[PDB]
């Protein structure tokens, strides 16, 4: 049994997206299908559902008028046409169903698909060094890092010495700044005496842009 989704992505407010959900492993045509969404760091809420035939459709009051749920039972696929998209429709979008029928639970869920509604546009990260220091040492350890700033959209990926350094490394979650651009830090705790002695270069890669940066942070 598998619900496999696609169609999510980045969109300007007022824009449109169409999600798809390819079902397999069960007779899709017999089930009420759902769309459930989850805003980043929030709970779960139903968006729309549809009767097995596709003959009756129902909607949460937020999405009502703007979203259209549908299905093609010959293709085993479920769809959600999303119009007049707002910032507050940003979420992971799951398709789900009651595979048992009798359970009244969402037995099967899709892997998810991220829908981002933002007026900000695709920008690459300025990588700044967080240089090791005396206000950065405590005990033997000295901390150092990279401030990957003002990029859009997510994600960026960060590694140290091209993967040759993974011990003590803490890459933090991005914060959406009031500008609409993201920002994160990646830090590593190393011994004071290795600075340096050893070279520390953080490898930032942001794939929505065609931008890769190798900042050498030093004392």
């Amino acid at each position: 049994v598998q619900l496999l989704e696609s169609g999510g992505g980045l969109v300007q407010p007022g824009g449109s997206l169409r999600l798809s959900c390819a079902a397999s492993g069960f007779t899709f045509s017999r089930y009420v299908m759902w769309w459930v969404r989850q805003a980043p760091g929030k709970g779960l809420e139903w968006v729309s559902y549809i009767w097995p035939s596709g003959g009756n459709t129902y909607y949460a009051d937020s999405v009502k008028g703007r979203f259209t749920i549908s299905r093609d039972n010959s293709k085993n696929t479920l769809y959600l046409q999303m119009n007049s998209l707002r910032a507050e429709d940003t979420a992971v979008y799951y398709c789900a169903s009651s595979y048992d029928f009798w359970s009244n639970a969402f037995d099967i869920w899709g892997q998810g698909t991220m829908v981002t509604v933002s007026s900000a546009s695709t920008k690459g990260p300025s990588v700044f060094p967080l240089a090791p220091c005396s206000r950065s040492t405590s005990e033997s350890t000295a901390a150092l890092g990279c401030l990957v700033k003002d990029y859009f959209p997510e994600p960026v990926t960060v590694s140290w010495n091209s993967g040759a350094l993974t011990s003590g490394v803490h890459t933090f979650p991005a914060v959406l700044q009031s500008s609409g651009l993201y920002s994160l830090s990646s830090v590593v705790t190393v011994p004071s005496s290795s600075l340096g002695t050893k070279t520390y270069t953080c490898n930032v890669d942001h794939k929505p842009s065609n931008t890769k940066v190798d900042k050498r942070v030093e004392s």
Binding site: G43, L44, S103, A105, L130, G145, F172, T189
Partner: protein, 211 residues
């Protein structure tokens, strides 16, 4: 809709522990209550249906009960894979979920190592100044990280971010970033990061004077 409320919003437990989450319905939903578990970056997974009926291949340690308004999920003996967020959900009427209960790994108190980083000269050149404060490898997750410029408490110009539990050593790390322009930056002098945590007997302050 019927409003659902779980408690607690998070709990700390050790492998082997008997834990118990509760769930309340705003009105009677009979036996129409399901439990789900969700791990970071994964879709929810169905655990219990019909209040008390264990799903597909959910371990025997999971157990639901209650009918009407108040329900409880119980893990008889917590395992490492059980650390996750648990949601309840009424299936009496149109579906509505509880706000979630995060089950976290308990370990000993570990005070944070606090570090402060001035803005690079590379950044100052671009017209913006970011000061980073780093709280490293601490427990519990609860920490307060206040900024102060010339001893004046700051508001609305910093953002925090916490990692997930190290899983190795089950601690957290926290990065707070204070953003200013090159203006209020070049005009002020003492930049302090003041950290409150239960591993420290009093607030630790890391600071630097600009220049």
């Amino acid at each position: 809709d019927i409003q659902m409320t779980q408690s607690p919003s998070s709990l700390s437990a050790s492998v082997g522990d008997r834990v118990t989450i509760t769930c309340r319905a705003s009105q009677s939903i009979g036996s129409y209550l399901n439990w789900y578990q969700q791990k970071t970056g994964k879709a929810p997974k169905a655990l219990i249906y019909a209040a008390s009926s264990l799903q597909s291949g959910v371990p025997s340690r999971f157990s639901g009960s209650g009918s009407g308004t108040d329900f409880t999920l119980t893990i008889s003996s917590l395992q490492l894979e059980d650390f996750a967020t648990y949601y309840c959900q009424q299936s009496y009427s149109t579906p509505s979920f509880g706000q979630g209960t995060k089950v976290e790994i308990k370990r000993t108190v570990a005070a944070p190592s606090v570090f402060i980083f001035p803005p690079s000269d590379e950044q100052l050149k671009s017209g913006t100044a970011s000061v980073v404060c780093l709280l490293n490898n601490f427990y519990p997750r609860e920490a307060k990280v206040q900024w102060k410029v010339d001893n004046a408490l700051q508001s609305g110009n910093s953002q925090e971010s916490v990692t997930e539990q190290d899983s190795k050593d089950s601690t957290y790390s926290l990065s707070s970033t204070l953003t200013l322009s090159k203006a209020d930056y070049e005009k002020h002098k003492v930049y302090a990061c003041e950290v409150t945590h239960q591993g420290l007997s009093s607030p630790v302050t890391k600071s630097f004077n600009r220049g």
